[PDB]
């Protein structure tokens, strides 16, 4: 037989285990709120050519956002929910070209994970995240594993690559999947466009302007469309596009630290061209 | 089209005996504590539900004898009573379906 966590518990002990395990998840998320009053790793300034961490965010949906020239910009909201750095591997142990940070998002039930994963998060001291994505990163940006990543890791004006699993459409035929409809070749070439399973694969939208970040609810408001359905987890990294490879001067380089307590941020950072709500109604004179 | 050659029993045995075509040994299967006939988890016991089905069958027959004809749904809640039981003080204002056997251990 196989079991599940709930199987042998009485009526009295099911909400007791819910309140117990839920309260230890809140305590473990609450203990990591002071990374700098802890012993972090040495913080370096930004050097030209270094990479920093990304994020993992929920896709909340879309909404319009009007700029000062009176043009709509359809904007996805991306909430950062319980994002944390999980493991740092240097380039020597990776045998890749660059160091890597494993970062995970969205706390998920402890009663539904493999035990090697629960031992991993138990030693790490965290409730287990849904997804773990891996970031290629230089040595200069390496936060200690176990630290919260926030919305203000990105700032307005920054351009951003977002990747996620697209909405799966199931088995689709040629007209929907690829959008259409030799003799001496006696065979069908590889990569031929045929019916098959559409969607449910990772795609990356490249170069998306971050318009507005909301520090209170930890929302990122990104230009355009992001792969993935609503409430999907996306991997939000800074853009690789070579017109945008040098603008890490003003970005907080390891990550944004509210624990640093230096010149704290407002409710919501806006890009300069955003018509904010509450501003008087704009006139083009 | 039509088959170009005839498939052999080596190919066929590899097709109809691989584990995607075999029956899975399932392991939901428990013993019902009340009857001891083995049940499956997440599903009621066939035996104990056959008990309950047969007693709802006799009770609905006597519902049909006390109603008489269709379109006789009462505006009153109902109480099933067995042999040698006074209707309680809570059972007042409820139509009564007298039975001829003993009260079961599981009806209550």
């Amino acid at each position: 037989s196989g079991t599940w966590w709930d199987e042998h518990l009485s009526e009295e002990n099911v909400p007791f285990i819910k309140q117990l395990v839920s309260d230890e998840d809140k305590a473990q998320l609450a203990s990591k709120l002071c990374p700098l009053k802890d012993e972090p790793w040495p913080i370096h300034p930004w050097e030209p050519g270094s990479f920093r961490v990304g994020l993992i965010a929920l896709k909340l949906g879309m909404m319009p956002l009007w700029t000062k020239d009176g043009q709509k910009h359809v904007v996805t909201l991306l909430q950062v929910q319980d994002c944390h750095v999980l493991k740092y591997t240097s380039k020597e142990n990776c045998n890749g070209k660059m160091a890597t940070l494993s970062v995970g998002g969205k706390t998920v039930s402890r009663f539904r994970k493999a035990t090697s994963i629960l031992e991993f998060y138990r030693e790490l001291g965290l409730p287990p995240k849904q997804t773990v994505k891996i970031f290629n990163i230089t040595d200069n940006a390496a936060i200690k594993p176990g630290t919260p990543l926030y919305a203000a890791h990105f700032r307005p004006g920054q351009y951003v690559d977002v990747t996620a699993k697209t909405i799966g459409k199931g088995f689709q035929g040629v007209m929907k999947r690829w959008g259409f409809k030799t003799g001496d070749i006696g065979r069908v070439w590889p990569g031929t466009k045929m019916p098959g399973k559409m969607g449910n694969i990772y795609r990356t939208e490249y170069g998306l302007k971050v318009w507005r970040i909301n520090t209170k609810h930890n929302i990122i408001y990104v230009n355009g469309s992001v792969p993935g359905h609503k409430n999907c987890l996306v991997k939000v990294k800074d853009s690789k596009l070579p017109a945008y490879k040098d603008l890490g001067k003003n970005l907080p380089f390891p990550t944004y630290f509210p624990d640093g307590d230096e010149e704290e941020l407002p409710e919501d950072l806006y890009d300069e061209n955003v018509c904010q709500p509450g501003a008087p109604s704009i006139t083009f004179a | 089209a039509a088959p170009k050659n005839r498939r052999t029993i080596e190919v066929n045995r590899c097709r109809r005996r691989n584990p995607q075509k075999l029956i899975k040994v399932k392991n939901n299967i428990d013993v019902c504590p009340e009857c001891g006939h083995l049940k499956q988890k997440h599903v009621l016991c066939a035996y104990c539900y056959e008990k309950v089905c047969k007693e709802t069958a006799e009770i609905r027959r006597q519902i049909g004898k006390q109603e008489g004809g269709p379109f006789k749904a009462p505006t009153i809640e109902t109480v099933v009573l067995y042999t040698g039981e006074t209707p309680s003080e809570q059972d007042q204002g409820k139509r009564i379906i007298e039975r001829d056997r003993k009260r079961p251990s599981w009806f209550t």
Binding site: - | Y47, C48, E50, K51, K54, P104, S105
Partner: protein, 211 residues
């Protein structure tokens, strides 16, 4: 079915009219449905005359000697499963009751010396002589299986056996053969068995209960 009434009522409901046809040959039985007078153990010279008027060379003072050899030799025919001698030695009321349940298992009965002399007890009587004999012997048994593993009785150890064996004779070519074997109601239980038994209770359909 389970009886003749069930088959004839089923043949009436079906429509099978089986006509009882008249045939001149019947079954020529050589046995009796049981015992004439049930000898209940702790003046029948009438039936000795009614035997000697047919047989006329018959000494009862020699008969429990003969009844020993009809007994013992018949039991040795179980050691080999020789049924064709058993039909000379045993009646046909007695042949299935001793050979049916012993089928597909080997028995290894053996006789050793009697404790008492065997002695005749009573004699009763188209005519069926019937003689009950008391035998008080020492026998050995080992009933094996299809698989040759012991299920009754140690093979060496002799056990003391009371035997109220009833013999029967047809009264032209027949002889004295074992007809039955009375077991008295006071008799002690037999040897216990090497294995254990589960005995089921009532198989309950869902509508009934155990009480």
């Amino acid at each position: 079915f389970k009886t003749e009434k069930e088959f004839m009522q089923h043949a009436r409901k079906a429509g099978l009219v089986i006509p009882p046809e008249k045939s001149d040959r019947s079954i020529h039985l050589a046995c009796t449905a049981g015992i004439f007078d049930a000898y209940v153990p702790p003046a029948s010279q009438v039936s000795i005359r009614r035997i000697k008027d047919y047989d006329a060379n018959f000494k009862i003072k020699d008969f429990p000697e003969k009844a020993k050899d009809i007994f013992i030799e018949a039991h040795l025919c179980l050691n080999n499963s020789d049924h064709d001698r058993l039909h000379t030695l045993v009646t046909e009321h007695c042949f299935p009751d001793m050979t049916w349940d012993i089928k597909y298992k080997t028995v290894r009965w053996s006789f050793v010396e009697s404790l008492e002399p065997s002695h005749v007890v009573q004699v009763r009587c188209n005519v069926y002589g019937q003689i009950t004999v008391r035998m008080h012997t020492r026998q050995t048994l080992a009933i094996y299986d299809r698989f040759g593993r012991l299920m009754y009785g140690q093979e060496d150890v002799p056990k003391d056996v009371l035997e109220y064996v009833v013999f029967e004779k047809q009264l032209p070519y027949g002889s004295w053969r074992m007809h039955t074997k009375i077991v008295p109601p006071w008799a002690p239980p037999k040897q216990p068995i090497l294995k254990t038994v589960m005995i089921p209770g009532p198989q309950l359909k869902p509508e009934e209960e155990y009480e």
